[PDB]
């Protein structure tokens, strides 16, 4: 089992061809997160390759890979491996699952130890979505994934979490807003929805008062970016 074979196998979504992988790993004291099983420039793992080749929301190598990884006794679980190159830095299988708009796959990953606060901060994403799984799910308007991330019993995502810019999901939404009537309406429903859920999930937290590394709340950030409709909406929330 060299890397080439595994990635081929996994790309084709044929779990049956993983026969002997576990034995090979345990015999040699190796893990699927090892340099050897990782693409040398990017750190792209076999599980990432799997989620990149989803067929109709699924890929039948995914759970086998997770199980083999667990059974191999891996100290640094494959589920939370991150891309290492400049362009995709921090990108995890969970981010790819959300980009692919697959709730099925998000669940499978989270149920098996996905860290819901890993940051994708590479040069390609500066579109920028706030580097966090929840902020990506919100920015791409995925209601089913957003509520799963917030409510699941394994690893609930925090609405207060911030990225390397100090941005919450609320700042991220301000960032992706267009000034088109229909887009801003949808972004407003997401902004309000998250806050409505926050009144229940974090009853005491003033999420809209959290400010940036640039000292900007979502309101002030909205003003800075020229986002009139979002700005005026955030104000009427107060008043």
What residues contact 81, with CB distance under 8 A and at least 6 apart?
Answer: 33, 38, 43, 45, 47, 48, 92, 93
Return the exposure string of 9-38: e unless at least 16 CB atoms fall within 10 Å of the residue's CB, then b. bbeebebebbeebbeebeeeeebbbeeebb
Residue ranges of domains in the chain: 1-239
CB 198 within 8 A of CB 189: no
Q: Is the dihedral of CA 43, 44, 45, 48 positive or negative?
A: positive
Rounded to 5 degrees, φ, ψ at 25 are: -65, -50
Query: DSSP code of 81?
Result: -
The experimental technique behind this entry is X-ray
The pair of structure tokens assigned to 238 is 């107060």
Greatest alpha-carbon span in the chain: 66
Q: How far is it, in rounded angstroms, from Cα 139 to Cα 190?
A: 8
- Short-list 106, 212, 208, CA closest to 157: 106
Q: How far is it, in rounded angstroms, from Cα 207 to Cα 47?
A: 34
Reduced to 3 states (helix: H, G, I; strand: E, B; else coil), residue 92 is strand
Reduced to 3 states (helix: H, G, I; strand: E, B; else coil), residue 238 is helix
Rounded to 5 degrees, φ, ψ at 84 are: -120, -20
The pair of structure tokens assigned to 15 is 């779990």
The pair of structure tokens assigned to 32 is 């699927």
Pick the CATH number of 1-239 from 1.25.40.20, 3.10.129.10, 2.40.70.10, 3.30.365.10: 1.25.40.20
Q: How far is CA 139 from CA 83, 107, 170, 171, in A?
A: 21, 19, 9, 10
The residue to which tokens 């394994």 are assigned: 154
Q: At what angle do helices 169-176 and 181-201 cross, to 10 degrees?
A: 180
Q: How far is it, in rounded angstroms, from Cα 179 to Cα 166?
A: 24
């Amino acid at each position: 089992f060299d890397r080439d074979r595994l990635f081929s196998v996994v790309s084709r979504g044929v779990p049956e061809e993983l026969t002997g992988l576990l034995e090979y790993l345990r015999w040699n004291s190796k893990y699927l997160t090892d340099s050897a099983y990782t693409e040398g420039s990017t750190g792209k793992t076999c599980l990432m390759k799997a989620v990149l080749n989803l067929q109709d929301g699924v890929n039948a190598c995914i759970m086998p890979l997770l199980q083999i990884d667990k059974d191999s006794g891996n100290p640094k679980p494959l589920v939370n491996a991150q891309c290492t190159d400049e362009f995709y830095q921090g990108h995890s299988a969970l981010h790819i699952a959300i980009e692919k708009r697959s709730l099925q796959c998000v669940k499978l990953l989270v149920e098996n130890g996905a860290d819901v606060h890993l940051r994708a901060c590479g040069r390609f994403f500066q579109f920028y979505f706030g580097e966090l799984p929840l902020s990506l799910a919100a920015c791409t308007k995925q209601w089913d994934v957003v509520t799963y991330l917030l409510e699941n019993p394994h690893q609930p995502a925090s609405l207060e979490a911030t990225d390397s810019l100090g941005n919450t999901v609320l700042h991220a939404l301000v960032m992706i807003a267009d000034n088109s009537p229909e887009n801003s309406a949808l972004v407003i429903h997401m902004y309000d929805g998250l806050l409505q859920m926050g009144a229940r999930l974090c009853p005491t937290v003033q999420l809209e008062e959290i400010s940036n590394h640039q000292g900007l709340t979502p309101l002030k950030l909205a003003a800075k970016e020229g986002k009139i409709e979002i700005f005026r909406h955030i104000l009427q929330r107060e008043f």
